Ligand binder design. Structure first.
Ligand SMILES: *[C@@H]1O[C@H](CO)[C@@H](O[C@@H]2O[C@H](CO)[C@@H](O[C@@H]3O[C@H](CO[C@H]4O[C@H](CO)[C@@H](O)[C@H](O)[C@@H]4O)[C@@H](O)[C@H](O[C@H]4O[C@H](CO)[C@@H](O)[C@H](O)[C@@H]4O)[C@@H]3O)[C@H](O)[C@H]2NC(C)=O)[C@H](O)[C@H]1NC(C)=O
Ligand SMILES: *[C@@H]1O[C@H](CO)[C@@H](O[C@@H]2O[C@H](CO)[C@@H](O[C@@H]3O[C@H](CO[C@H]4O[C@H](CO)[C@@H](O)[C@H](O)[C@@H]4O)[C@@H](O)[C@H](O[C@H]4O[C@H](CO)[C@@H](O)[C@H](O)[C@@H]4O)[C@@H]3O)[C@H](O)[C@H]2NC(C)=O)[C@H](O)[C@H]1NC(C)=O
Ligand SMILES: *[C@@H]1O[C@H](CO)[C@@H](O[C@@H]2O[C@H](CO)[C@@H](O[C@@H]3O[C@H](CO[C@H]4O[C@H](CO)[C@@H](O)[C@H](O)[C@@H]4O)[C@@H](O)[C@H](O[C@H]4O[C@H](CO)[C@@H](O)[C@H](O)[C@@H]4O)[C@@H]3O)[C@H](O)[C@H]2NC(C)=O)[C@H](O)[C@H]1NC(C)=O
Ligand SMILES: *[C@@H]1O[C@H](CO[C@@H]2O[C@@H](C)[C@@H](O)[C@@H](O)[C@@H]2O)[C@@H](O[C@@H]2O[C@H](CO)[C@@H](O[C@@H]3O[C@H](CO)[C@@H](O)[C@H](O)[C@@H]3O)[C@H](O)[C@H]2NC(C)=O)[C@H](O)[C@H]1NC(C)=O
Ligand SMILES: *[C@@H]1O[C@H](CO)[C@@H](O[C@@H]2O[C@H](CO)[C@@H](O)[C@H](O)[C@H]2NC(C)=O)[C@H](O)[C@H]1NC(C)=O
Ligand SMILES: *[C@@H]1O[C@H](CO)[C@@H](O)[C@H](O)[C@H]1NC(C)=O
Length: 490
């Protein structure tokens, strides 16, 4: 109905488009049946040209896929609209080509540069990162999937101190920006960061109907008040803030979510999250006409610490577990081409926003940058996963449990209460603290004395607030990566 020739909403000046091998997609609206010519200029020279015609059927859209472009810039992109004796031209300037990353999640990734530690110096450190272009999607929800973005908080723009730290939970994600900054330090070519994030949302709002069907999520349509403070309805956030973007070619996705699922559909998270990334991969693949990799990188953050009221069953450790598909590490078979950052040891007790919103986002960006370099940018043989036990065995006569880790381990502190084992007597189990007894470069021996001989399972770091800041027991000496939490059965 709106027949005004225009680019898509997220196509503006200063943007970053996807680089070779993938081809950037340029689409917009116009008059049905009119002809559209999209020309890419390097300076004043027209490097390339594609031709298409605006759909005469329902969509009312015109779309071209450019040829692979080499990272760099600046470029210009022009679209010309012609029909009969009617002529129109659109031009966007200072376009760059490089790796585009989509950041989404809830309030912890909404947190801005102005809100984190060392805020001012990070805010004003942009001089070497002017080719790290940024955009923040405004909060909109919709009952049905949308073809275009309704509302944009921060259009494509070069980073400045003001737009980096532009308020409380507003413009630029500290995590997204810092991660893109590490990425630019490494890659040294243009990076684009599009952040569409809504605080206090459950993963159901971010998933389409397909994931809900695949995981048999209860079709309440609504979600317990306190658990989630944002849009309850299913898939609305996805419909209005992520679906329109799936026609943009992007390098990868950064994801920080799970806090709102601690007490809502907890036990289905190990289904929904892998299903979510898979559905996003497929939908972006078809939306960009195959330009986005069908298995594009999906880097995510494991939930951080949280000072929580005492509870018999805490959701946070369960969600930390389910975020790995109950496997303890990524990438794994259920999540190929994915990297993770463990953040439970980066707890902030005195944060003004809450224990759940720690201000140390630089360390998170560093660990995510390790994961990305290893999994995505061919920096193999770089330690990006924390020490995880390859072998667990039980010595019933010695009343011990011998655990051996794949990587060498280094002891930062002993915690009698961090290791817990389950005591199933009369076939009724009970979780009890198991103190560490012996330690070695690659193995440690736990003690069973409090549980007699009915041992069934062990678990490590299964508390919402497991340790104090950067003070967890087990660490890698070289990589400064913490031993991730886990549960194992005997
Ligand atoms: C509070 O926040 C500020 C702002 O971010 C931090 O200060 C920056 O910290 C980063 C990271 O330490 C510094 O970046 C490093 O700079 C070194 C040289 O930078 C100078 O020289 C280059 C030209 O060579 C100039 O372009 C640049 O502007 C600087 O003048 C690099 O050598 C570093 O890279 C390598 O270092 C290690 C090895 O030691 C490698 O392992 C790395 O992978 C990497 O390859 C790095 O790029 C930056 O210079 C700091 N200053 C500013 C103004 O940003 C504070 O650290 C932070 N403080 C606290 C307490 O949180
Ligand atoms: C994604 O993650 C979720 C949560 O981790 C998984 O859902 C649970 O998975 C576990 C393990 O597969 C299931 O546990 C089974 O529970 C049975 C009884 O359940 C009752 O008791 C528990 C607690 O006591 C209550 O919470 C529950 O509501 C019921 O009242 C046990 O009988 C099972 O054990 C039997 O078989 C095993 C097989 O080896 C023996 O070792 C045991 O001794 C015993 O004979 C088992 O413990 C649990 O039922 C699942 N649901 C819930 C709500 O907890 C998903 O499976 C997981 N999905 C994927 C794909 O990873
Ligand atoms: C960017 O890439 C994405 C990739 O998905 C594309 O998104 C697709 O957009 C179209 C919109 O045209 C979506 O298709 C629409 O689905 C409607 C509802 O489907 C459900 O409900 C119907 C009955 O209610 C069932 O039959 C069906 O099986 C589903 O269960 C259809 O009703 C739509 O057709 C009707 O809508 C238009 C209104 O615009 C009418 O004018 C038509 O005449 C027709 O009656 C339509 O098919 C599609 O679902 C989206 N993809 C996905 C995966 O969901 C974008 O199109 C693409 N953008 C560009 C510019 O290329
Ligand atoms: C960004 O947010 C911080 C944190 O505040 C908390 O989180 C926000 C998301 C909101 O939900 C806030 O309602 C919430 O408290 C803000 O810090 C707060 O700053 C204000 C003003 O500087 C402080 O208010 C005053 O505090 C003095 C104490 O000396 C009282 O006497 C006054 O009457 C008045 O209440 C407030 O204490 C402070 N809160 C915390 C927890 O530190 C911050 O202002 C905000 N910044 C911007 C730019 O919006
Ligand atoms: C716990 O398991 C580890 C792992 O095997 C044992 O350490 C091994 O000890 C043998 C002794 O001959 C060495 O040859 C291996 O090289 C050791 N492995 C490693 C990784 O160091 C350890 O002895 C076991 N401890 C107990 C009490 O059973
Ligand atoms: C549209 O106008 C521009 C500038 O006047 C011109 O270069 C172009 O050839 C025109 N296209 C038509 C008339 O189809």
């Amino acid at each position: 109905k709106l027949v005004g020739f225009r680019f898509a909403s997220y196509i503006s000046d200063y943007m970053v488009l996807q680089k070779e091998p993938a081809g950037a997609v340029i689409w917009g609206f116009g008059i049905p049946g009119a002809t559209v010519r999209v020309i890419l200029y390097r300076g004043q020279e027209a490097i390339m040209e594609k031709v298409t015609q605006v759909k005469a059927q329902s969509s009312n859209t015109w779309m071209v896929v450019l040829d692979p472009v080499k990272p760099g810039g600046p470029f210009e992109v022009m679209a010309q609209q012609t029909l009969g004796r009617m002529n129109s031209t659109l031009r966007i300037h200072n376009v760059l080509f490089g790796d585009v990353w989509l950041c989404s999640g809830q309030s912890n990734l909404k947190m801005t540069v102005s809100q984190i530690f060392n805020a001012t110096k990070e805010m004003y450190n942009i001089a070497p990162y002017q080719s790290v272009r940024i955009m923040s999607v405004s909060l909109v929800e919709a009952e049905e999937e949308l073809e275009d973005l309704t509302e944009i908080d921060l259009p494509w723009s070069k980073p400045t101190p003001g737009n980096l730290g532009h308020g409380n939970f507003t413009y630029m994600s500290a995590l997204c920006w810092l991660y893109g900054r590490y990425l630019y330090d490494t890659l040294r070519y243009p990076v684009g960061l599009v952040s569409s994030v809504w605080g206090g949302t459950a993963i159901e709002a971010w998933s389409s109907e397909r994931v809900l069907k695949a995981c048999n999520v209860p079709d309440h349509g609504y979600i317990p008040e306190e658990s989630v403070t944002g849009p309850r309805e299913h898939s609305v956030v996805w419909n209005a803030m992520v679906h329109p973007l799936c026609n943009m070619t992007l390098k990868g996705v950064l994801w920080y979510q799970g806090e709102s699922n601690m007490d809502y559909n907890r036990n289905l998270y190990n289904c929904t999250f892998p299903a979510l990334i898979e559905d996003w991969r497929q939908t972006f693949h078809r939306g960009s006409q195959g330009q986005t990799e069908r298995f594009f990188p999906f880097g995510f953050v494991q939930l951080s610490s949280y000072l929580a009221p005492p509870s018999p069953d805490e959701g946070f450790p369960h969600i930390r577990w389910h975020q790995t598909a109950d496997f303890g590490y990524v990438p794994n078979v259920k999540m190929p081409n994915t990297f993770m950052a463990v953040t439970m040891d980066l707890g902030d007790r005195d944060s003004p926003f809450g224990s759940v919103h720690p201000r140390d986002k630089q360390t998170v960006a560093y660990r995510l940058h390790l994961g990305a370099r290893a999994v995505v940018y061919g920096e193999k043989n770089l330690i990006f996963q924390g020490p995880l036990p390859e072998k667990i065995e039980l010595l019933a006569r010695q009343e011990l449990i011998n655990i051996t880790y794949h990587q060498q381990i280094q002891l930062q502190r002993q915690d009698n209460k961090i290791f817990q084992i389950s005591c199933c007597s009369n076939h009724q189990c009970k979780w009890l603290p198991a103190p560490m007894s012996t330690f070695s470069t690659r193995t440690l021996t736990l003690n069973t004395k409090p549980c007699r001989d009915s041992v069934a399972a062990v678990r490590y770091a299964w508390d919402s607030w497991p340790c104090e800041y950067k003070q967890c027991p087990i660490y890698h000496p070289s990589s400064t990566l913490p031993a991730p939490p886990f549960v194992a059965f005997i």
